[model samples]
Target: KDYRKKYRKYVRSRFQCIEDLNKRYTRLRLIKEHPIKMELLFDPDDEHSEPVHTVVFQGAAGIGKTILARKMMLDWASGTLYQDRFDYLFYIHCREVSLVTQRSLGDLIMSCCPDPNPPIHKIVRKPSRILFLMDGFDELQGAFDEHIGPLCTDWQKAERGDILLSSLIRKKLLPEASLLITTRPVALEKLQHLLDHPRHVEILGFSEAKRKEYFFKYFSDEAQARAAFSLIQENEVLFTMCFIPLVCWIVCTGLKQQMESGKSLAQTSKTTTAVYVFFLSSLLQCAHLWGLCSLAADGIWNQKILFEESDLRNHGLQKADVSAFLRMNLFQKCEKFYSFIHMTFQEFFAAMYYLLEEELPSRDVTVLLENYGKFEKGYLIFVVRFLFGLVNQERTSYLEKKLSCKISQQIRLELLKWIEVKAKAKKLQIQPSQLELFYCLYEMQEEDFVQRAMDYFPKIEINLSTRMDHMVSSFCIENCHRVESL
Candidate 1:
């Protein structure tokens, strides 16, 4: 009973909105129950009779993986989920674990219990009854290619945290204990190799009906929610983006503020970058935008999502100043630890940092783009796209007015020159990398620039695959008057 109470209280406090800490009128409320299909958890196909010991929930960033995981833990504590299958559930955030140098599995379990002298031996006696919900596997450093030295089979033996974790997943320790891990799609391949035929489930955030339901739930006024939903529906791009819960929250929150202040929802911008910029502008009046952006850029370059107090101090951001961002839901805090709500937002701010900072002789935007191309690991892909969007002539003026920062016009010319040089190489065949360049051009929203950029590639042949591919290709193809094939 004490364990249940402590675990429930811990989850409730940690999951409660940072927005509420600052006494914001608009707050984040937990969904009573996620609409995700639960059949995979309970029902097994003919291929397997025993319950799956390892389950993987994969999704893109901000598609509700962590929330869903936490919801399950909360439900289990409240006697609503996995009631018979497991007697105990322990939630471990990999991001948090990454900070620790060493710990034993027993130590981890003990940390979760209410009593310092709890019955650890009794808990370990029935490994089959314990469920470990490991969240954010991708956030761990060296996750994709870490050389974990010999697996530690003993749960009570102290070892490097990563080694212990790998051992647990490999079933070297507590083999009968079940695990449910959540990660971004990028890490799925690496994770699969560590498990024994784990069941996989993808978390596709919000269908159309659910999107509408979310809007209504976000706003107190029924008419405002209706207006918000209708307005978003009119823009196909924004509507599609609403399918992601994080983007939906940003959109609804922006619209809610607009509606409450007697502004028309129809006036909101349609593009994703524009929506993000508008949202930032609204909350950036008092906060240190540059400081936050610097922190974001540093985190991006270093692949560090979770930041310590020293990280914030290094970027000229104090705890008090960061509290405002936390309250705005731009940054999330657990104790002294901090991170952007999603890495997508981190990329957005990183892009902003490049534009907002003064153009030093040492730093060149062209060089940065070159490095991004060289890596090609899909890390800074969104950052590059956002860079293109931010420097658009119209967006430049908007940002300048709202952000009160002078964006160097030189970067715009540098980007066009970069495109011309890239096209001149004329690889002569369409690759996914080529599509990214087209995406960059499309984001600029400049017909003349698009025409000039497309002119570099005299002959073009491309095959469309996804909806996004079609959208981007059509825009670029229309400008390519001299295409050899399609």
Candidate 2:
């Protein structure tokens, strides 16, 4: 039903280059791939021999290239064009993490066959009818030039590269056997040198008519559909950027958000940053549901975790009145697992951090009375506990080293100092022993820092760490999004 989906179908139509599922819903005029060639790539007149073993469908991001490739493979499997039926039609998505392990011919072959079959069975059974449809050579991991050059000359592998190129450029050898690869335009040039006559396809953005066609398709009501049409037309730039499927989806969502407010449709703002700012603002809006804006902001920006009601309910932290001191995702891969605030709610954290720090920290020291009272005691302790725990990882070394005794003692003293400072504000001093227990959990921060630097600097500083931000350090930098807690 979606126009972009249909667009993908068009690309993968018989003799088409590439098609993407995302573009099927857009009803715009599409530019098709070069007219079909009867011959398969690198194929000889012998109908039984496999034709071209390689073909790359290149274009910019969001193009329906992948769609076309998928369709192409399906066509071969369906026995649409080739004289003989091909047995295997396997798709290798280059974006997969395991591509690195797929460098060798054996790995590539094994990837196509995911069973426990014997080696001989796999070789004879795998390559005969199997059509190797590698989807994204451009996105392939590792050094592309270095890794793939050998595949062209290596014949022991199902299809030799030299023969493959011949069949493809000639477009006739294996009328039955086929291969299709998809990649973005930037990566296309790196592949040009390895080709005979490269075929280029362009997936242009929608025209005005197609945009209106889509408006009506989504908004069936005649009056509202036309009205939505005017709204999108009024903000051409916003619509222009929405040429990609994801962008178009965002536009529909944005417009729907406006529509739900029960007001006349306002023309979308003609700003390039329109979609850029939407995500951050959306997360902040989501925060209202949890009543967690202030605490989340404080913990993220200042690396300070304050005990709050939400923490108590969620983590049972406040029976102790504490949540994670701070959960830092100082690694890149961690980003996927951790939805970071910086990347997701970027400006909100900045606004919160700076707004709270409007005044310079007081320089003069004022000694408090043994009983500073609840206002000073409870609130201040809550603030400090939140900060130390939030940014720094929590742990007492379980080492058998004799120095741990000294470490434990120092931890005890610091815990008492913080708790004494807190309890004194309330005119209730915790006994020395209670404070010592706190010490094991809250180490002497400065001492811990020194010891950590000594123990980890040679390896981490050399290989991972770079500076105080941990944000810029290699370990965290590569995984910067981990720090983006919301």
Candidate 3:
């Protein structure tokens, strides 16, 4: 009972804060206003269904997977969820887990428990009573590979971190234990192949009603909320983008700042990249901004989400400096570990870091784009898009004036050259979708540049699946004077 009390307290403390753009709201408040319906988890698809041992929640980036996973952990701890089904609920963040050098399944469980000497034996004794909530499975390095050597079946054996995870996931160790895994859509197919008879659930972010509720919840003033919502409603692109909770928060936070400064919502830029630029400008009013950008850039290149104190110091950032970003909820800190609130923001800042450099080489920028192009990761595409956005003549001048920093325009010419070269290449292997190129061009918002870039493509064939894709493709098509084929 003492162990239970301490564990409950720890869970509460850990999952208490739902950090927003500029404020930290309690989980109860956020959950109350925007209740996530996860009844499917407890329900069976068929009447004579086998008991669910593994469930995977797939979502796009910033679609609230982590939040939902945390919510489950919180509810389980509070005796509001999985009451009789499970006696022990362990929340293992895959990002942090990936960082561990070596740890047994017992060590992992004991780390989460508050007791100095956790009863691991008792906990693992009844595998059916244990529920492991593994958040951000997509972030796990070298996951979903069949080539992993020798899966450890012994719960007490300390092996490679990924191998231990693979063992647990494949049900080689603790076969009866229930598992809840959350990952981005990119990893869903791979994950599905690795699991056995797993139930799949996709998080569709916020609905129209929830988006409005979020705006109202974000702004205390009803009038302001209504006005903001109405304005966003008018901009179809912004409104569509708001379906993602992180984008909604960014929109609300940027608009709120504008209103506070007595700027009209109608006068604000409506483009997705414009909104991000506004958010960047607002946050750039700090001395540690560049330091944060440096860290963000390094993290992006290395595919690292979590950072240590040494990483901070290397980037000329201090713990106190990071607290400022933490207050803004742009960066989150857990004990000695630090990470951007979302990977999107990290990519955005990394783009800025490149643009803000005193003398950035064109080759370095090309290499960055090429490297990102080689990855199937969705987050890296945003880095390329942001590069185009930041280098836009208008945004460049705006940022230079706002931040009192010089942004080199040389990369703009290099990008245009790269685009032309890429289009002219006979063997055009599209690692990223052709739509992505259009989106990058759309972000630049330069008619002449768009026209020139579009002309370079000998033939263009793109399947417009999403609304955003159509919008971006139309913009590029409008500027194209000649194309052999569509």
Candidate 4:
């Protein structure tokens, strides 16, 4: 019975604003709308509205899925949501579960409950009354791959990791139990057909109004907030990306730092990489800078997100340094679990490390060019943008100033040559509406490069939309010089 009480508090304890990591977790009393409201996504009040035995909250990295999950937990713990329909609501981190190679459903239930000695018989009597919240399904490290082995179908049967997960997700362990899962877009297909009557919802980050509201909440001084907000307002790309709550935090935090330092906010946030570089600069010093970035790149290359202490040390970083950076939200922690604050930041560091490395790139330059033809994944696109950013003299100067170190001219030139060749090849495949190309160029921030690539600019075949107009002209200062011809 005590375990029941513990579970409620433990889940609700994670309800703080995760976008800012320094604060202790506290319950959220009023969860507001950010384009998609938690109420609409998981309306416990409207229980009979739809079949939702299993619901997945899907979005790109840092879209606030976990925050929404914790908010739901807060509401349920306080009896304002779910109306006590569920006897027990368990918050399960899939990453933690991924490490276990063997376990039974009963073991999982007992281990997660507040009391190690809780009566298993009493809890199992009505599986229908239980709800499980699984966060970061993508961090499972392929532990749920069905091809690994056969899954355990019996609730009390012990089995291998993949089997247990497959059975639980397939609803064999507790057929009537409710489940909620959070995952990035990449991992959704793994369990698409396994869950029974699964509902899909998306976290659309922040809207224009919500973005403004969030900015106010982020900054204590109203004037400072207003100035930062005003700067983001005019930069349409940064403004659009701000709809993402994590990006909102990054933009706001970076802008505030620049403002305090008497630096230009607009100049600091001209591109995504510049903003992240500034944010990372605040968290780190010159001593461990290369090590941290190389660590990030190693993780990206290996496709591992959740890292242990050994992972940090192996990359020449000290645990103390990692902890300090985590305080600044450069990393995320869940109990003992650790990962980068967001996937985008990981990619940025990865790109930065690749450029800083003395060794030649692993693959043939042509193979690299062929593979990097376009941006398919969000992280890959960011890596490319940051790579371009590191080579851009103006942006690199800002980075150098922030880090209080001079970047290697020879290295920059080497990377610039690689980028130029790739950029030239990418230009040949560019279509008028292929805005990604322009985004790549814009992040490069080299006026001479943009001028040279003017011939590669796609001609507008039709009247471009308002959104397109801003992004296109913003890409190259003179992109619109020939727009009248359209």
Candidate 5:
């Protein structure tokens, strides 16, 4: 007798991989992602190609790829991993720069190891001893074919000559060098097909035990851990929350928010109100710490007058020098020219921007794109003009102003009769990517495919080979660089 079975291959679950990745590695504890870092000793024999050691770790959003890569470097640095074998270990950060015409891999590498005094020879006495942890392969701005081909000679075939792609490629930087590449699912399939080589390491998310352990690291005892675990287990909308790092952060922070917001534990069980799911204080914490909400407003306000300190004060930022404040408080960390970590963080925040904004719509509240400095939606213009004799209001203050500014008698309205365009305001008709980002927000949160696209909103541009420097720039702020594994 035989059992009839049609079994489906389960791809690595997002959280499970991160969990295993953390468990198997030792140096991880110092930095948080050590488990997958078995090759810190700079294994030269593991390579299936020209480069003696190469491994590609791929996964969905928030699945600890970068952390794992960093841990490997940390291990080598600590002498716990590959201290004796490799003379130099360089962590090439690719967050601030892009792997396109505008930015170069050489530039990114130079900036990170810029201690010109060390000199290449001094740093790497042995050519094969270098360990390059190039991260964020998927975030390159655009056109890897043109920008990435020159560095690694065999880029096309792993022989002769082809410039290696961004540090994230790590395909085969050197014959005996150990290279680790970390990235999400954005264009993994296409890029993996294009490069066509390298051992693939897929990172699933945390296991339930790992998830419990991770949350407990932030909390105190079993009671608090179980309570948070209970919330994760019961909420269908939030079960996926454990897979991504930031989501977990927001949830843990949200628990504190829930207690402070006067929400009953019973109300906490309701996941329908996604916005409320984030406790007000936690929202404030995330926004304030990341400067996200304020930056969205600041970046938009700067579209006209270039928001100064005085203006930011009006928006409730206590700091007098707004730009300087953000630069010091947030941008300095994020705008590190271009690092893979910063790019990944910005992309994630762009999604979070809408995840928060869509919460309004989640509760049947309709917030217009114009409110967020977006003025598209021509289809609506036709209806407004025909039914209400309303022209496209020539673009002015958004509905948000109604709450922010209090005017008893006279209210300003923009109209064709007035015909005075701010010029700084985007013209009517064609949608700005930001609005497209927000409008697609709710639909994305509800669907899996759309959610993936939204997850890497900018990286997708790189894969599509589109002009994305500006698109990626819109999501930029200070903290994306500042707040990291440090």
Candidate 6:
């Protein structure tokens, strides 16, 4: 009774539980995400338990791993799960932990919890029955490699952040304690070898059907929700991204804004990039847009995921400006750690900054492609894609119209030359790297470029990389005006 009540008291005020904004707009009781089973890792009824001391929950950015973590806390607080199995659960944010240089596990717990004065010794007494949730594993700064400083063996001992975390994760500190970690998929490799026989759970957020459910939840009027859902449904990439909770919110909120202003969703957002740009334009003043983009650009250049408070101020943005923009679900702040709502948004803004601020030189473009294109999963893949999308005349024209600012037209010429060179190489059969040209052309959404590229091909051997490349290449060739076939 005492341990359960103690855990309950701590989480009651401490937990940053997922708050669904749609609740205020729609009367439909929030369709709660499916409850994760209690024994996701081991069989509670079995005498011989699974050797799964650590449970790893991984997903893409903003796929609601954190929300699910909080849900566990909420359920445990309300007696829905872990009532008899666990005594205490300490929910730790790795973002906050990374900010600490040297601290004891006891001190770290207090910093993590809302309790002004937590009983440290009392909490650590029953290590065997306690659970520790370290959320946002991807947000932790520093190299995640195993070769690091000496790790501590005592939970009550003081140690540097990395050492302390290593101790906890390696089961050096409390061998008997149950540990659950959540992170983006990128960080999975770093954490893979740390635990022995850990159970893995991937939180692939809302399905296509669930996305529609959320859209209806966001708008009270069924017609508006249906209309909004319909727009996203037509666009496959946008529809797929909507599976993520934050992206879903962004789509809902962006659609809501256009509807409230008596405009069609398509009028402002014709493409995926346009939807985000429209959302940014709606929320920020021109100055604020530049400020945020400047920060985003700097981070992209430096290849950083998590940013510090100084990063915002360095860009000449006030904390108040950050707070205002954060309300729109464009950025996130976990303690002093800052980042875009998702890495995708960060890459989008980074591309936006580069397009608006830097000239797209052929030499630089070539270098960028060589460096970033290697990672099929790199953030730069989207950055380059969004860059092409940003320069799409339709998107730029709308952005210019909305912002009342004319962007430089130099990118188009550079892109044209880049595409022409790639097309020439592809035609010569000197290279099998045809996907780059196709991707950039598809991303631009320029029919002219598509037709031009199709005309360049002699014998269209459509053994391309992605299905999109295959589909688009076929569309372009079939629609080519007067191209001769070999």
Candidate No. with top TM-score: 3
lDDT of 4: 0.63
How do the predictions measure up, each by TM-score?
A: 0.81, 0.43, 0.84, 0.74, 0.52, 0.73
| CA shift of 284, model 2, Å | 4.9
lDDT of each: 0.70, 0.38, 0.73, 0.63, 0.39, 0.65
Task: Count steric clashes of candidate 5.
Answer: 40
Off by over 4 Å in 4: 1-3, 14-50, 143-149, 191-195, 262-268, 282-285, 332-334, 357-385, 388-394, 398-486
Arrange candidates, best TM-score first.
3, 1, 4, 6, 5, 2
In model 3, the clashing pairs are: none
- List per-candidate RMSD values in Å: 5.3, 21.0, 4.7, 6.2, 16.4, 6.6
User: In model 5, where do residues sit more than 4 Å from their true spots?
Assistant: 1-37, 40-52, 98-110, 114-116, 146-176, 193-196, 260-263, 266-281, 284-486
- If the candidates were sorted by their lDDT against the true structure, best first, what order would they fall in? 3, 1, 6, 4, 5, 2
Candidate with best lDDT: 3
- lDDT for model 6 comes to 0.65
Over 1-486, each residue of candidate 5 has an lDDT whose tens digit, in order, gives: 010010001111221333214443312221122144564322334544244465666754446666666555544555566646665555654433333333333343345552443243333345466556666664433334424444452212332111345323533343455666666644454356444346566676665566666677756666766787678878754554464554464566667556556766432322212322233324333324234443432232222112344444554556433444343323321121211122223322222232232211111112322332222111122111111111112211222222212211111122211112211234533323333333222222223322333433332221221122222223321112321337
lDDT of 6 by residue, 1-486 (tens): 564576687676455445412132211112212144554443332455644567777766667777777777766776667777677777887755653377888888777555577777777788877788998786664445577668788777888887888788888888878888987655666677677556676776776678888888778899998999989888766775576676777778777777878976763343456666767666643656667666776666554566777777878778887787678677776255677877678778767765554321222454554545322224265677677777776555434443322342565666666656666663544322455455556666778766765566555455663343555465555645664556
Candidate 1 C-alpha lDDT tens digits along 225-335:
898899878977778677678888888877766776786666356455777777776664433666777787777665577898898887878767778778877887625
- For model 4, how does the per-residue alpha-carbon lDDT over 196-288 read when each residue is reduced to its tens digit? 766677666666777788888788889888888888788767777676687877877777667777866673366766667667665543666
lDDT of 2 at 182: 64
What's model 3's overall lDDT? Answer: 0.73
- Give the higher-TM-score candidate: 5 or 6: 6
Tell how far residue 236 is off in model 1, in angstroms. 1.9
TM-score between candidate 4 and the true structure = 0.74
* Clash tally for model 1: 0
Q: After superposition, how far is residue 99 of candidate 3 from its true place, in Å?
A: 5.2
